[PDB]
Design a protein around this ligand. Structure first.
Ligand SMILES: CCCCCC/C=C/CCCCCCCCCC(=O)O[C@H](COC(=O)CCCCCCCCCCCCCCC)COP(=O)(O)OC[C@@H](O)CO
Ligand SMILES: CCCCCCCC/C=C/CCCCCCCC(=O)O[C@H](COC(=O)CCCCCCCCCCCCCCC)COP(=O)(O)OCCN
Ligand SMILES: CCCCCCCC/C=C/CCCCCCCC(=O)O[C@H](COC(=O)CCCCCCCCCCCCCCC)COP(=O)(O)OCCN
Ligand SMILES: CCCCCCCC/C=C/CCCCCCCC(=O)O[C@H](COC(=O)CCCCCCCCCCCCCCC)COP(=O)(O)OCCN
Ligand SMILES: CCCCCCCC/C=C\CCCCCCCC(=O)O[C@H](COC(=O)CCCCCCCCCCCCCCC)COP(=O)(O)OCCN
Length: 249
């Protein structure tokens, strides 16, 4: 699967390329043109990701070259991280039970873009969830995520402190001089320095957990985001992903 992990780096380059075209675009109508000119790529990729029950394990394999050299590891990874067509269906159904009464509906050209692709996402049609609802939740959520990452001040503070602490453990100047600036260089740096970057991640996460949970919980509260007409428990979600997913890497 050296070509399939090649597939993922090739897809991420084209994705980041779409992104840099949208960021540096003069207005919405230009970004909407940019998304439509990539219309078949975005729909093919979603469909291709969702039908590849091993896609997550192929992402792990970019970062652990030592996994491809051991089918026991790979298969103990497929036990945790492989998802089926019905897992995808189940996850879409669960997605539409999120309510965000905290902000009006979004209708810009991204939302109109979003509704043009969904009748071609095969497994989304299979779910028989109403497009109006799914679009509404997805557009409200991604509007919140992007707005909070750009505008939330506690998040900016926290990002700054993790950034500074990072710089005291890794020489970013010497990384830039060894040309670890691109996506491939960055992938290779992490995969060859696995144990360290993962310990850096764990330690920064543990040091800053209370802030991070608090910030995200205050976001879900301040937009009244519910799951099954109930408050969302960020702490429980984060501890959950930790015990069943992150810890098994
Ligand atoms: C811009 C693109 C970025 C997107 C990419 C997404 C990447 C996600 C994860 C990538 C890397 C994750 C961490 C890698 C570390 C792997 C090892 C590991 O994390 O497993 C172990 C679990 O512990 C631990 O802290 C685990 C640390 C806990 C982390 C909890 C994560 C919670 C995040 C929740 C986000 C969910 C989103 C939904 C929002 C509601 C830690 O390592 P070990 O040496 O076994 O032991 C040391 C400790 O266990 C104590 O003994
Ligand atoms: C560069 C990034 C490196 C990331 C490293 C991985 C970190 C992972 C942390 C994120 C959260 C973990 C997600 C685990 C999802 C897999 C679990 C799953 O199978 O879903 C099952 C339930 O399904 C659901 O509810 C939702 C499933 C949807 C997952 C599929 C989503 C596709 C993922 C593709 C990611 C995007 C790729 C883009 C990159 C170019 C679990 O049920 P089970 O009882 O455990 O089934 C047992 C039978 N196997
Ligand atoms: C693996 C399973 C997961 C796949 C799920 C498929 C979803 C992929 C579909 C992507 C199509 C885009 C969907 C529209 C999202 C609507 C977000 C939204 O509400 O718009 C705004 C959110 O902000 C933005 O998104 C601004 C635009 C920046 C980039 C937007 C789109 C990124 C393009 C990604 C291209 C890659 C697609 C390929 C995926 C495989 C609302 O914010 P605002 O403050 O009102 O103003 C923004 C001013 N720039
Ligand atoms: C970087 C981009 C961030 C995107 C964040 C929003 C994406 C939404 C989907 C993300 C995956 C959600 C992970 C679900 C896995 C948790 C599985 C689980 O434990 O089951 C359930 C966990 O509860 C849920 O499923 C919540 C449903 C997902 C909604 C989470 C979205 C919250 C919004 C956060 C946005 C904050 C933005 C922060 C910006 C950095 C327990 O539910 P229960 O059975 O009714 O019992 C209640 C027990 N307390
Ligand atoms: C960037 C490169 C890729 C990085 C990989 C990260 C991608 C993962 C993020 C999205 C995938 C969702 C992550 C959580 C995985 C689900 C956790 C899980 O184990 O499954 C179940 C999930 O828990 C839930 O009840 C639902 C939680 C909310 C799921 C909604 C958000 C994810 C689904 C979105 C589907 C995306 C595909 C749609 C594409 C258009 C456990 O449910 P259960 O009630 O306990 O009963 C079933 C078995 N007990």
């Amino acid at each position: 699967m050296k070509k399939d992990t090649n597939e993922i780096v090739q897809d991420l380059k084209k994705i980041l390329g779409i992104v840099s075209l949208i960021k540096s675009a003069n207005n919405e109508h230009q970004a909407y043109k940019i998304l439509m000119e990539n219309n078949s790529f975005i729909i093919r990729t979603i469909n291709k990701v969702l039908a590849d029950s091993n896609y997550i394990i192929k992402i792990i394999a970019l970062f652990n070259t030592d996994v491809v050299s051991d089918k026991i590891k790979l298969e103990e990874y497929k036990d945790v991280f492989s998802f089926s067509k019905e897992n995808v269906i189940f996850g879409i159904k669960c997605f539409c039970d999120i309510t965000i009464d905290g902000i009006d509906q979004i209708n810009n050209k991204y939302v109109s873009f979003f509704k043009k692709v969904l009748p071609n996402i095969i497994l989304f049609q299979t779910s028989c969830v109403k497009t109006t609802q799914f679009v509404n939740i997805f557009s409200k959520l991604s509007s919140i995520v992007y707005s909070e990452i750009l505008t939330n001040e506690r998040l900016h503070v926290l990002f700054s402190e993790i950034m500074a602490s990072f710089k005291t453990k890794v020489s970013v100047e010497d990384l830039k001089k060894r040309k670890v600036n691109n996506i491939q260089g960055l992938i290779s740096e992490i995969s060859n320095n696995r144990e360290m970057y993962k310990n850096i991640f764990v330690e920064e996460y543990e040091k800053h957990k209370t802030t991070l949970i608090s910030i995200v919980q205050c976001i879900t509260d301040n937009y009244n985001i519910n799951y099954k007409e109930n408050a969302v428990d960020i702490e429980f979600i984060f501890d959950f992903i930790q015990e069943h997913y992150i810890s098994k890497l």
